[PDB]
Write a protein that holds these residues in place. Structure first.
Motif, mmCIF file in Angstrom:
data_model
loop_
_atom_site.group_PDB
_atom_site.id
_atom_site.type_symbol
_atom_site.label_atom_id
_atom_site.label_comp_id
_atom_site.label_asym_id
_atom_site.label_seq_id
_atom_site.Cartn_x
_atom_site.Cartn_y
_atom_site.Cartn_z
ATOM 1 N N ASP A 106 43.552 56.926 79.458
ATOM 2 C CA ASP A 106 44.504 57.988 79.750
ATOM 3 C C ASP A 106 43.767 59.324 79.841
ATOM 4 O O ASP A 106 42.890 59.605 79.017
ATOM 5 C CB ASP A 106 45.585 58.022 78.659
ATOM 6 N N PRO A 107 44.067 60.142 80.858
ATOM 7 C CA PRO A 107 43.402 61.452 80.988
ATOM 8 C C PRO A 107 43.574 62.381 79.795
ATOM 9 O O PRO A 107 42.660 63.162 79.508
ATOM 10 C CB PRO A 107 44.059 62.049 82.246
ATOM 11 N N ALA A 108 44.715 62.332 79.099
ATOM 12 C CA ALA A 108 44.937 63.232 77.967
ATOM 13 C C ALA A 108 43.971 62.942 76.823
ATOM 14 O O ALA A 108 43.505 63.866 76.147
ATOM 15 C CB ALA A 108 46.383 63.131 77.486
ATOM 16 N N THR A 109 43.667 61.665 76.588
ATOM 17 C CA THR A 109 42.653 61.312 75.601
ATOM 18 C C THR A 109 41.255 61.703 76.086
ATOM 19 O O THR A 109 40.394 62.073 75.277
ATOM 20 C CB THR A 109 42.775 59.811 75.288
ATOM 21 N N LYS A 110 41.039 61.694 77.406
ATOM 22 C CA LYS A 110 39.732 62.034 77.970
ATOM 23 C C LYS A 110 39.340 63.484 77.705
ATOM 24 O O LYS A 110 38.157 63.772 77.494
ATOM 25 C CB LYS A 110 39.731 61.753 79.472
ATOM 26 N N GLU A 111 40.307 64.409 77.717
ATOM 27 C CA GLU A 111 39.997 65.816 77.463
ATOM 28 C C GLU A 111 39.529 66.048 76.029
ATOM 29 O O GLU A 111 38.647 66.880 75.789
ATOM 30 C CB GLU A 111 41.210 66.701 77.781
ATOM 31 N N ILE A 112 40.102 65.326 75.062
ATOM 32 C CA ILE A 112 39.740 65.518 73.656
ATOM 33 C C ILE A 112 38.420 64.855 73.290
ATOM 34 O O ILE A 112 37.944 65.032 72.159
ATOM 35 C CB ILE A 112 40.897 65.032 72.757
ATOM 36 N N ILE A 113 37.805 64.114 74.214
ATOM 37 C CA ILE A 113 36.487 63.536 73.979
ATOM 38 C C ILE A 113 35.457 64.653 73.875
ATOM 39 O O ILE A 113 35.365 65.520 74.755
ATOM 40 C CB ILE A 113 36.123 62.553 75.102
ATOM 41 N N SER A 114 34.680 64.637 72.797
ATOM 42 C CA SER A 114 33.653 65.644 72.565
ATOM 43 C C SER A 114 32.396 64.935 72.066
ATOM 44 O O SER A 114 32.260 63.707 72.152
ATOM 45 C CB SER A 114 34.142 66.718 71.590
ATOM 46 N N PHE A 115 31.450 65.721 71.549
ATOM 47 C CA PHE A 115 30.137 65.196 71.194
ATOM 48 C C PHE A 115 30.185 64.282 69.973
ATOM 49 O O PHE A 115 29.406 63.325 69.894
ATOM 50 C CB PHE A 115 29.170 66.360 70.968
ATOM 51 N N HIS A 116 31.077 64.542 69.013
ATOM 52 C CA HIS A 116 31.140 63.691 67.832
ATOM 53 C C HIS A 116 32.069 62.498 68.012
ATOM 54 O O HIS A 116 32.055 61.595 67.169
ATOM 55 C CB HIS A 116 31.615 64.457 66.587
ATOM 56 N N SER A 117 32.880 62.491 69.066
ATOM 57 C CA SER A 117 33.901 61.466 69.232
ATOM 58 C C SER A 117 33.263 60.105 69.508
ATOM 59 O O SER A 117 32.327 60.007 70.303
ATOM 60 C CB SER A 117 34.846 61.846 70.369
ATOM 61 N N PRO A 118 33.753 59.036 68.873
ATOM 62 C CA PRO A 118 33.135 57.700 69.011
ATOM 63 C C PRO A 118 33.472 56.976 70.315
ATOM 64 O O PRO A 118 34.319 56.086 70.402
ATOM 65 C CB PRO A 118 33.680 56.964 67.786
ATOM 66 N N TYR A 119 32.763 57.357 71.375
ATOM 67 C CA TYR A 119 32.937 56.759 72.689
ATOM 68 C C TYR A 119 31.579 56.400 73.270
ATOM 69 O O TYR A 119 30.554 56.984 72.915
ATOM 70 C CB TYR A 119 33.683 57.696 73.643
ATOM 71 N N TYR A 120 31.587 55.431 74.182
ATOM 72 C CA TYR A 120 30.350 54.891 74.726
ATOM 73 C C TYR A 120 29.736 55.851 75.737
ATOM 74 O O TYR A 120 30.424 56.362 76.626
ATOM 75 C CB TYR A 120 30.600 53.533 75.381
ATOM 76 N N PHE A 121 28.436 56.091 75.591
ATOM 77 C CA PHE A 121 27.629 56.770 76.592
ATOM 78 C C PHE A 121 26.320 56.011 76.728
ATOM 79 O O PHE A 121 25.896 55.316 75.803
ATOM 80 C CB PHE A 121 27.381 58.246 76.230
ATOM 81 N N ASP A 122 25.685 56.136 77.887
ATOM 82 C CA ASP A 122 24.460 55.404 78.172
ATOM 83 C C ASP A 122 23.326 56.397 77.938
ATOM 84 O O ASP A 122 23.305 57.476 78.538
ATOM 85 C CB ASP A 122 24.503 54.849 79.609
ATOM 86 N N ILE A 123 22.387 56.024 77.063
ATOM 87 C CA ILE A 123 21.318 56.935 76.673
ATOM 88 C C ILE A 123 20.282 57.114 77.780
ATOM 89 O O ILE A 123 19.612 58.153 77.824
ATOM 90 C CB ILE A 123 20.679 56.454 75.350
ATOM 91 N N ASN A 124 20.141 56.143 78.687
ATOM 92 C CA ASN A 124 19.174 56.283 79.774
ATOM 93 C C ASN A 124 19.593 57.374 80.750
ATOM 94 O O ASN A 124 18.749 58.128 81.248
ATOM 95 C CB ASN A 124 18.997 54.952 80.501
#
Ligand SMILES: Nc1ncnc2c1ncn2[C@@H]1O[C@H](COP(=O)(O)OP(=O)(O)O)[C@@H](O)[C@H]1O
Ligand SMILES: Nc1ncnc2c1ncn2[C@@H]1O[C@H](COP(=O)(O)OP(=O)(O)O)[C@@H](O)[C@H]1O
Ligand SMILES: [Mg+2]
Ligand SMILES: [Mg+2]
Lengths: 567, 110, 225, 228
Positions: free
Chosen positions: A249-267
């Motif tokens: 959902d886009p509304a949850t996407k806005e609250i994503i920040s640096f400490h939030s536990p979501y997947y990112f690819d380190i490469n």
């Protein structure tokens, strides 16, 4: 009679007792030792009970033998019921006998209810009396088990956890509710718990994207450098990379920040930072690039295009972060490319889920177990502080978020989780060095705040004097197997509440397997014998003598070199 | 007209500049002798009963009280929401099947 | 009798022994030292083994010699088998004699199995008492040999490694499976192991490309500028 | 002086014979490999110590990969002896020895389960880092004479002996004090006298100084220096 002893002098918390006859010698051997029990009265219905702190048997030429016993009143017994407290005063003289088996039984069986008793040991001086603890207060307040090597610390830790597992409410069959996590460095609890889930480096996958803001910059940034441009480019890469991989959902996407536990690819995060080492602004101060789809300007909408490597800078002047991040990048891929960190920074972290990490950490997956053993033997020591802090914080905030669900439903925190820290001085030292800062803070929040969220500790450390005072004092329950280092004994004496005469010379002289239980879990601090492990821990150590004693092996060396080349 | 109530846990780690400015002092059961020695130093021998303090008891000292004395604080008829988790009684039941969906939704939220 | 010693005071971990008669002086020099072992019993079957911690010998013009020994009950023996004990009580007075050789041996030999015994040293106050270590557990856990210069720590290192090399399973003839690497810096272990492989600068070939990035920076760069 | 690490031999040597050299699994087998690092310059001594200490550790790290795949009873245990361990692994966090510190501290922390264990032999224990010295379990404490080294050792010893403060500077020659897992109690021992003792070829300065003023030897030093 067999014994003729009486109190010659009292104090606020001390009875000095003179043994006058001592006809029967085995009374002195087992019933008059340090930590034994004495009944102090003139009748056989109301009495005080007393631990023995100290004794001295003087013998000389012509005068009588001077057997003096220093005792401290532990409580009051009335008609078979024991009442704790040294407030009751015995006016001397009072006839002193060794306490019978029923009085010592009533000492521990009266302060704790029939459903709150947690028995895993018996008294060392009297085997026939078991020593239960208030198992609610045993486990809610944190436990510290200390002792030297070979004193039986891991056997005591294992025997507590088996009694936690095997105890059940009646009327049901199957696994109980207890959740225990063990940080196993010496790999000893496989032999203790065969029917449990164990996770080593080859099996456990800890996602790096579950690391919080503090843990991510410890693992990757330099604390000593403290470069805010390197800090800002790290957060703005990971925050953006978590946005582009979110499918929700886009509304949850806005609250994503640096400490939030979501997947990112380190490469791609390295590629974004490496690209931002090569920015080239134009005369309008905007960075311009060119991937395969055409030229673009670096802004919020097109910053995701820097995650791919195939971008070429197009500009006249040096960019905003040009040349300011090269030492950042080379260390960033130094830890990614290392094969020791495949369990944390490898390809396996892409395919795991925030649920799957929790389901594996407290054994809630396909195979369910009360005991989850984290074999961190193969974990490299520079990320041991990171990995312990990641798991400990993942259990604390699960314990926090479990409670806040139940506060909405007006319920208690359902599952309580215990974490056992074998060799706890390595994660949480007294030293204020930054390399063990993140594990120190993770155990700090469990020690000081985790009591109200269902997350607790079992600090099992060989050297308590290398654990910090601010976490050792939070461990209300204390178990002392055998402590031989003088600095180790002076450390625990400075952190112990009262208990004079039961530690001063007792700790070096304790047998193997017997310990000293104290705190609000127990009625009085007593020397108990921890009951033997029928399924004992057994670390598979390399028996150096027998492997050196045999023939010089020749076939193995060729296999070691080529396997090193294959991997 | 702005004063402070310092509801700390161990006095040995609080900054000196605030804890010296406080004059009225309430000390409950203190099991660390380093914590005891700081409370002992503030007094100009009742500190020896600090570790053996029963639950709810306190030692009040300062110019607000006439003498430093061991007191029993009144029970809270309307108590704060501080419920101790019964570790044994919770662990005795079945393995409760708790779904992880609702917990990690708000963990991801904040 | 040779020596007539007797326990006069008993503490939880301390023993006071009064030596009343000392006919043989040689018991005092060798068997009543600072770290010597005393057996405390009224019979030859079951004894309380105690190590000495302090002593004092007083002589005055009129009174008898006051030889006092302060000992600590480190353990207990029963029919030759030693049990390390805590606060096992000996009711005074108890006859004290120097400990037998088989009793002192049983303190060190009984704790280790005969297959795992590794001997490279003997007791300082009793050269007949071999002191074994658990060689299973001696090597896998790390060893730290500390002393001053001229205390003999190069000899202690050499003696341990010689004892770890000549030992075998006896079912074969040849070299055993010891693998010891010495970072010999004072050029001294060549003599101790004549049948070993020694690598000086002229013989060692260390590849520079096996160095990591941290090592390669120090080999070539300067860090001061 | 850097020919052993940067010469033409270092390029042509392959990865396998390097470990045949350091472990003595080459043409001539040997239980004991003595690495004479005396002629190694001090600027690169921590580099060469850390290179070998790393190479032995990953030999033991990749040792266990076969033993979990093949489940064979055989194994290669390795002990590493660090004479003067206080300069390879100092307390100081300076950049010059952190390579040799990190290699030793990896062995002291992870090397137990991989068969790569270490022996620390230092005359100045107080300079060795506590995060390495405390990883040891068996301590053979010989005559310790400096009060700083006496106080350092007494803290990190796993046990104590009666009046250890005067015991340490009063130990005789060969007298030691073993505590730890291997021994039952801390006992004062006499280490066995070495029949074949470790002897270093030392220059007897006074013995050559009382001789006549040598004349021929000065010219042969210059001509070899000139030719090499
Ligand atoms: N309750 C007990 N009774 C008898 N022996 C015990 C008991 N507990 C431990 N031991 C013995 O003590 C030895 C040391 O084990 P342990 O205490 O686990 O080591 P550590 O203290 O290093 O964890 C074990 O070999 C075991 O046989
Ligand atoms: N166990 C022993 N018994 C008798 N003499 C010894 C013993 N150990 C060492 N020595 C002697 O003491 C001297 C000290 O040398 P060593 O202790 O090897 O040097 P360092 O302690 O400086 O490494 C040696 O020359 C040796 O002859
Ligand atoms: Mg253990
Ligand atoms: Mg030497």
């Amino acid at each position: 009679n067999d014994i003729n002893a009486e109190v010659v002098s009292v104090s606020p918390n001390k009875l000095k007792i003179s043994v006058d006859d001592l006809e029967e010698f085995k009374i002195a051997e087992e019933k008059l030792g340090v930590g034994s029990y004495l009944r102090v009265s003139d009748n056989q219905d109301v009495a005080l009970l007393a631990i023995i702190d100290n004794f001295s048997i003087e013998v000389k030429e012509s005068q009588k033998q001077k057997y003096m016993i220093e005792a401290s009143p532990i409580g009051l017994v009335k008609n078979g019921k024991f009442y704790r407290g040294g407030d009751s005063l015995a006016l001397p003289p009072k006839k002193v006998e060794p306490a019978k088996l029923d009085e010592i039984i009533s000492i521990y069986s009266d302060s704790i209810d029939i459903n709150d008793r947690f028995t895993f040991s018996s008294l060392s001086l009297n085997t026939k009396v078991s020593v239960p603890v208030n198992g609610n207060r045993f486990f809610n307040k944190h436990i510290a088990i200390v002792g030297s090597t070979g004193s039986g610390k891991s056997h005591t830790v294992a025997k507590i956890l088996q009694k936690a597992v095997d105890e059940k409410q009646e009327g049901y069959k199957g696994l109980n509710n207890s959740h225990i996590i063990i940080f196993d460095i010496h790999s000893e609890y496989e032999n203790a718990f065969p029917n449990s889930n164990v996770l080593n480096v080859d099996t456990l996958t800890l996602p790096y994207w579950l690391l919080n803001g503090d843990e991510l910059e410890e693992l990757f940034l330099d604390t000593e450098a403290n470069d805010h441009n390197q800090r800002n480019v790290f957060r703005q890469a990971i925050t953006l990379n978590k946005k582009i991989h979110f499918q929700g959902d886009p509304a949850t996407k806005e609250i994503i920040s640096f400490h939030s536990p979501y997947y990112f690819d380190i490469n791609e995060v390295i590629n974004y930072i490496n690209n931002r080492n090569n920015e080239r602004k134009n005369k309008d101060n905007e960075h311009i690039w060119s991937d395969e789809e055409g030229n673009f300007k670096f802004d919020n909408e097109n910053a995701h295009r820097l995650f791919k490597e195939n971008v070429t800078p197009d500009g006249s002047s040096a960019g905003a972060l040009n040349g300011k991040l090269l030492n950042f990048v080379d260390r960033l891929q130094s830890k990614i490319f290392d094969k020791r960190l495949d369990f944390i920074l490898g390809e396996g972290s892409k395919s795991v889920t925030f649920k799957e990490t929790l389901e594996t950490l407290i054994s809630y997956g396909k195979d369910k177990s009360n005991i989850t053993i984290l074999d961190v033997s193969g974990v490299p020591f520079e990320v041991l502080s990171i990995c312990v802090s990641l798991i400990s914080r993942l259990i604390f905030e699960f314990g926090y978020h479990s409670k806040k669900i139940k506060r909405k439903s007006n319920e208690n925190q359902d599952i309580p989780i215990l974490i056992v820290y074998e060799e706890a001085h390595k994660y949480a030292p007294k030293s204020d060095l930054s390399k063990y800062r993140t594990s120190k803070e993770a155990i700090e929040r469990i020690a000081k705040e985790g009591r109200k969220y269902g997350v607790t500790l079992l600090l099992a450390s060989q050297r308590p004097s290398e654990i910090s005072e601010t976490i050792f004092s939070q461990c209300n329950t204390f178990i002392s197997m055998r402590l031989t280092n003088p600095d180790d004994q002076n450390y625990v004496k400075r952190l112990l509440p009262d208990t004079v005469g039961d530690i001063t010379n007792l700790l070096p002289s304790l047998k193997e397997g017997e310990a000293l239980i104290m705190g609000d879990s127990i009625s009085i601090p007593s020397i108990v014998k921890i009951e033997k492990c029928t399924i004992p821990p057994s670390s598979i150590d390399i028996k150096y003598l027998d492997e050196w004693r045999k023939e010089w092996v020749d076939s193995e060396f060729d296999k070691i070199i080529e396997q090193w080349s294959k991997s």
